[PDB]
Amino acid sequence: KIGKTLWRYALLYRKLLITAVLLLTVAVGAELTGPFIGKKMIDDHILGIEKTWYEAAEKDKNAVQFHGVSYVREDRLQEPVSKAKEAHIYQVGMAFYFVDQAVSFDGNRTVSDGKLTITGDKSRAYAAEKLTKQELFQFYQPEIKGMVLLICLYGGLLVFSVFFQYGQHYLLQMSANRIIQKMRQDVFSHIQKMPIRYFDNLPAGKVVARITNDTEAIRDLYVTVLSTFVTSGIYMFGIFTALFLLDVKLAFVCLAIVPIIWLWSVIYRRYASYYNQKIRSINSDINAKMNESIQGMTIIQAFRHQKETMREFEELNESHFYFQNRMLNLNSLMSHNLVNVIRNLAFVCLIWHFGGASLNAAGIVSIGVLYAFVDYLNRLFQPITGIVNQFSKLELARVSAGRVFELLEEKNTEEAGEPAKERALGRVEFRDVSFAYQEGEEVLKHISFTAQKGETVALVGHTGSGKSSILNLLFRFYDAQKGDVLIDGKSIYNMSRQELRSHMGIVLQDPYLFSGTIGSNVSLDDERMTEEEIKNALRQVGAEPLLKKLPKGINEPVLSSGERQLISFARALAFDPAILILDEATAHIDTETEAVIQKALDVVKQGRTTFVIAHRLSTIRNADQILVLDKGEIVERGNHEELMALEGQYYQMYELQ
Amino acid sequence: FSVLKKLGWFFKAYWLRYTIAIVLLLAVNVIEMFPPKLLGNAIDDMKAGAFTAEGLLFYIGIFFVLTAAVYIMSYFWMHQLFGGANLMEKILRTKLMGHLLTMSPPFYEKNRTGDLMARGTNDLQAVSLTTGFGILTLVDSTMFMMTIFLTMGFLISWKLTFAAIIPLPVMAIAISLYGSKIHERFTEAQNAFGALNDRVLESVSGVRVIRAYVQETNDVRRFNEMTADVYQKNMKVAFIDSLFEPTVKLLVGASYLIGLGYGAFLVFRNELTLGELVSFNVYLGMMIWPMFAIGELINVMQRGNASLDRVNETLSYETDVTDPKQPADLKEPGDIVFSHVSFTYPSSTSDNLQDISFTVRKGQTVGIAGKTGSGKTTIIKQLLRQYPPGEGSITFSGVPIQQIPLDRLRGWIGYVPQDHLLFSRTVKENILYGKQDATDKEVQQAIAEAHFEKDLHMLPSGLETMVVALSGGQKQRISIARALMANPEILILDDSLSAVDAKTEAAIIKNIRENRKGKTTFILTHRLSAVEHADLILVMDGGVIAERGTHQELLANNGWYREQYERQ
Ligand SMILES: CCOc1ccc(-c2nc3ccc(-c4nc5ccc(N6CCN(C)CC6)cc5[nH]4)cc3[nH]2)cc1
Ligand SMILES: Nc1ncnc2c1ncn2[C@@H]1O[C@H](COP(=O)(O)OP(=O)(O)OP(=O)(O)O)[C@@H](O)[C@H]1O
Ligand SMILES: Nc1ncnc2c1ncn2[C@@H]1O[C@H](COP(=O)(O)OP(=O)(O)OP(=O)(O)O)[C@@H](O)[C@H]1O
Ligand SMILES: [Mg+2]
C-alpha cells in the first residue's frame, strides 16, 4: 500500500496544499476567462456592424453619420422603438454594402450593380451602395472605447493570473519539500531504533539508499502528481466548463475526445513499460560488463580473451540498440504525430460544425465562438504528452515508496531507555552463554567467567573463533539465545540498553572518525565540554595537540592509522566508561603509534575492568584472568606467568617470533 | 557549433539518412503552414456570401490529406533522425570499448575507473543527444521560426506581426537567464544533499560506536539540522523554479493580446479579415516553440562539445606497449635469460629494480622468494609485457621479448595473478578462459591436476556456481586450474598457494613438477617450502638479488634463514 501512506503523509501539511489548490483555481479562472474576453471582443465590436441599424438622433446618441442621415445600431440605441426606416450593412466578397430598407429573410448574397439579392427562394432584392474605407471606419468607430476597455480588462486578469500561478507553484513545492523532510526525519528515527541484526545483513549502501534516495524519488513523485496531474485536471475541467458555457452542441465532441487521452495513455504506457524495462536492464548489463572488464583487464589481455569479451559486448550493444529503435518507433507513432493528428481532426470538426450551421442559416454563424474554441483547444492539447510520460514513469516512484514504507512499517524494534546515574562498579559475570546467529546453530557453546573491579581479561583463540562475538553479546547488539549475563547484581537483560551502554565503552580495530573537528571527534559533540577533551591531551596525547592551528586542531577527513587509534583512546578516556570493552588493535603498522600505543592502552586501562582481544599475545602480559575460545568454549585459563599457558604451544614462541 | 564539425566523420559516413531527414523536415515545415491559413480562408468564405457544400467538402478533404501527409512524413523524418542518433551512440560505445580492450596497465593507472565509466556512460549520451536533438532544434530555430515569421509577414500582415512579436525575444532572454540561475541554485542544493548523504552514510556505517556511546540522539539532532539545511536549499531552488511558468504565461498572453487588439484596430480600417486574424493567432500559438528550441540548442551544443572533447581525449591515447614490426619467427621459448634488467614503474621512486642477471634454462623451474617490497612480482611483470621495456635485454633464446609478438608471447605465458581476478561467470566457463575449444573432459583433467577435484559437492550444484561472488577457498584453485588447462610453455605462479593448506600445497607443487616436466615453471612465494625443488632460487633485497645460489648454496650462505624458521 503506497497511495494510502502517501495520502496520510500529505494530510500532514494540508493547509499548504489547500491554499495551493485555491490559488491555482483562481489563476486558472483568470487565464480561462481571457479567451471569453476574446470572444466578446470579436463578436460585439468587430462583428457589431452586422446587426440591424435604425434612424439616429442628431447628437452623439451612439450614432454614426452617413451622407445626409445618421444611423445607430439596435443595441446601443435607447428605446425609440421604431420598426420602419430600418437599415443594414451586408458584407459581400470583401466590400460592405448599405441597405436603406429591411430585407426580411436573409441568406446567400450576390450583387450585380445595386441589387444584392438574397438567394432557398430568390425573390428578394434590396437596393445597395458600396461603403468606402472611410465610411466603414466611421461605422466601426463607436466600438473603439469598448475595445479599449476589454483590452485593459484582459491585461489586468493576465497579471492577476501571473501572480497567482507563481503563488500556487511555490506553495506546492513548499508542501512537497516539507512532506519529504518529515518523511526523512521519521525514517532516520526508525533507522536509529532498528536492531543491529538488521544492519549486519544489509550493506551500508542499501540503508543509505533507503534513507536518502527513495525519499528523493518520493519528492519527485509528489512534485509530479501535484503539479502535473492535479494541475492538469483542474485546467481541463476549467477549459471544458468554458467550452460548455460557449456552445453545448460542440463541447460534447470534446467530451468524447477525452476518452482518446485515456485510450492512448494506456496503450502507450503498456508498450513503454516493456521497452524501457528492457532498455534499462540491458544498459545496466552493459555498464556492469564494462566495469568488470576495466577491472581485471590484465587477465583478459594475458589470456588473449579480447576477441570474445568484445563479442559479448557487441551482442549486448546490438540488443540495446534494437530496443532503443523500437522505443523510438513507438514514441514517434503514439505521442507527437498523434497529438498533431488529433489537433487537425479538431480543426476539421470545427469547420464541419460551423459550415453546417452556416449553409442553411442567416445569422447563426458566430466567429467569436470559433475563435474561443480554437484557443481553448490549442491550450488543452499542450500537456497531454507530459501527462502520458509521467503516467508511464510513476512505476519507479511507486516501487521506491513500497520499499520505504516497508522499512518504516517494520515491527521488530527496541525501546529507547534512559541513562542511569549510578556507575556500575567493574564487574561482569557470565553465568553461562549460548549464542548463534542462525537457528539450530551454536556459535558460542559454553562460556562462564567473572571480572573483578580491576582486571585485564583477554580472549584466546584462532581466527574466526568468536573472540569479538562476546563484544557483540555484551553491548546487547545480539541477545543471548539461552544463556545469561550479569553485571553487578542484575542480569543484563533486565535493564534498558541505554542504561547499560552508559557504564561501558568501546574501541574497535578501525577507529571510526566522525566528520568535523578533531575536538568534536573526541567528544562526539556532547553536553560535556572544557577539560573533557583537553584532559585526554594531558593524559597520553602530547604531540598532536601542540599542532594547534585551530581550537582542538580543527581539521578534515583522514590520520593514517596511528593517530586514528590515538583519537579513539582519547575518546574512550574522555567518556570515562567503566568496562571499556576493547578490541583487536593493529598497532605496529605505523611505528607502534610512535611507540605510544602501549602507553595509551595502559593509561586508559587503569581503574576499570578491561577486555583486550589483541591479536598479539605479548601485549597481555599483565592479565589476571585470560580466557580461551574452543570455537565458543573455555577449555583452559591462567596467565603467561601464573599457569603453564606460556608453555604447551598455546602461547606460541612463534607468536613471540 | 564546433561539436557538429568534430563529428564530420559520422555525417560523412551517414549522409543519405541525414539528407533525407533534412528534406523531410523542410517539407513538413512548409506543409504545416497550410492548415491555419485554410481555416482563415474558410472563415472568410463563411462570412461572405459564397459558401456551398462543395467548398466544405473541399476543405474537409484537403485538411485530411494534409493531416495524413504530415503524419507520415513526420514519422519518417523522426525515424531517420533518431535512428541516426542511436547509430552514433552505438558507434561511440563500440569504439570506446574496443579502445579500452587494447589499453595496458599504465593507462588504467593514469585513468581512474570512475572517469572511464562516466565517459562511457554519460558523455556518449551527450554526444548522441547532440547528433539527434541538437540537429532537430537547429532546424527548428533556423528554418521553422523564419518560415513562420515570413508567412505572418507576407500573407497576414507586416505591421501586426512586428507588433505581436516583441514579447517573444524577451521571453527567450528571460528563459535563458532563469535557466542559468536555477542551474546555479540546483548545483548548490545538490552539494547540500550530497553532504547530507555523506553524513547519513558515515553515521550508519559506524553504528556500533554510536550505539555503544548512547549518542543516538545527537546523531538524530545533526541529521535534523542537515535535513533543514537541504530543505532550505531546495526552497531557494524553488523560489526561482516558480518563475518559469509565470514569465512565459505573461509574455505569451501579452503576445496574444497584442495580436488580437491590433487586429481589431486593423479590421476596423479594413486592412484584414477575421479569417486572417484567426490565422495569425494560430501562427503565434505554433511559433511559441522555436523560442524554447533556441535555448535548447544553445545548451545542447555546448554540453555535446564538452562531452565529445572528453570522449575524444580519452580515445586518442597512444598504446603503451608496441606490438613489434616484422616479428621474429620463433616457434617456442627455450632458455630464458636476463642480461641487465633495471625496471622502473612509471611515476615511481629511483629504480625499483636493478640488473637481475639470471638465466632459466628450458625445463628448469626456478622459485623466487623474499621480502615484501623487495620485488618478486616485478620480474614477471617485466616478463609479461605489461609495462614498457626497461634496460638491457630480456633474451628469449636469442630474440628479445620486444621482437616476439604480443599474441604468440601471451600464448606462451601462463599467468596466475597474485591478486585473484576471476570473473563473475560460471565456474565451468570461468576455468575455460585458458582454452575455448575445451574438448569436453580436459577441464575435468585440469581440475584433477590442480587438485580442485576435492570439490565434490561442497559448492552449490555442480560446475555451475556464479563464483554473486560466492566465497570459499576455491578462487585460487580455479585460477591455477585455468592456467594449467591453458597448457603454457611457461607457467608463472604468483603467490598462488598463499591460502591453501600445506598438504595441498605440496600436492600441487609436486604435481606441477611431475606433470609440467619439459617446460619452465616460475614459483613466486614467501614460504620456502614451495621453492624447495627449484634448481636456481633467487632472493631479492630491495632491488637486487642477494645471491644467485641454489637451495643448498642459499641455505649455507648469509642470505635469509627463514627456512631455519622452518614454520614448525
Ligand atoms: C489569458 C491569456 O493567457 C495565456 C496563457 C497561456 C498561453 C499559452 N498558450 C500556450 C501554448 C503553447 C505553449 C507551449 N508550447 C511549448 C512547446 C515546447 C515547450 N517545451 C520545450 C522544452 N522545455 C523548454 C519545456 C517544454 C513548452 C511549450 N509551451 C505555451 C502557451 N502559453 C497564452 C495566453
Ligand atoms: N554479524 C554476523 N552475521 C552473520 N553471521 C555471523 C555474524 N557474526 C558472526 N557470524 C557467524 O560466525 C561464524 C563465522 O565465524 P565468526 O564470524 O563467528 O568469527 P568471529 O566471531 O568474527 O571471530 P574473530 O574475531 O576471531 O574473527 C558463522 O556461523 C557466521 O554465521
Ligand atoms: N603501482 C606501482 N607503481 C610503482 N611501483 C609499484 C607499484 N606497485 C608496486 N610497486 C613496487 O613494487 C612493490 C610491491 O610489489 P613487488 O612485487 O615489487 O614486491 P612484493 O610485495 O615482494 O611482491 P608481491 O606482490 O609478490 O608480494 C612496491 O613496494 C614498489 O616497490
Ligand atoms: Mg569475533
Side-chain angles (χ1 to χ4, degrees), chain A residues 30-31 34-35 154 158 379 382, chain B residues 249 252-253 256 285 288-289 292 296:
Chain A
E31 254 150 34
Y154 200 123
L158 191 50
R379 293 182 183 174
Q382 158 152 0
Chain B
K249 291 273 180 50
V252 178
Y256 282 176
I288 290 286
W289 151 239
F292 294 125
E296 293 264 43

Side-chain angles (χ1 to χ4, degrees), chain A residues 199-216:
Chain A
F199 284 71
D200 273 343
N201 305 2
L202 286 68
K206 282 206 184 160
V207 290
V208 175
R210 300 261 195 82
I211 288 164
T212 64
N213 267 333
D214 301 9
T215 47
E216 191 83 332

Side-chain angles (χ1 to χ4, degrees), chain B residues 130-150:
Chain B
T130 310
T131 291
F133 193 80
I135 299 308
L136 164 56
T137 70
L138 172 49
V139 171
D140 284 338
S141 151
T142 292
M143 161 65 187
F144 191 44
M145 160 162 99
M146 225 47 73
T147 291
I148 277 161
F149 185 65
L150 298 182

Side-chain angles (χ1 to χ4, degrees), chain A residues 437 464-470 472:
Chain A
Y437 302 76
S465 300
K467 251 205 218 190
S468 54
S469 202
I470 198 154
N472 282 356

Side-chain angles (χ1 to χ4, degrees), chain A residues 47 109 173 177-178 192 194 287 295 301 306 308 314 325 340 355 498 506 513-514 525-526 654, chain B residues 32 47 86 94 101 103 113 121 202 211 213 215-216 218 222 231 234 238 241 274 436 568:
Chain A
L47 254 61
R109 317 167 286 275
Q173 296 230 334
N177 264 294
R178 289 278 190 70
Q192 287 271 287
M194 268 288 169
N287 278 316
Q295 299 298 144
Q301 270 154 224
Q306 324 173 95
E308 291 279 356
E314 295 302 320
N325 270 9
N340 228 0
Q498 279 49 25
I506 197 185
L513 273 290
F514 300 129
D525 289 345
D526 252 348
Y654 294 61
Chain B
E32 250 188 3
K47 284 221 300 175
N86 293 359
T94 303
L101 273 170
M103 261 315 112
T113 286
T121 288
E202 194 280 352
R211 303 217 182 204
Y213 283 115
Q215 300 293 313
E216 61 204 273
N218 295 18
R222 275 227 280 288
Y231 157 87
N234 274 17
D241 160 49
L274 295 174
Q436 289 238 316
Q568 262 54 70

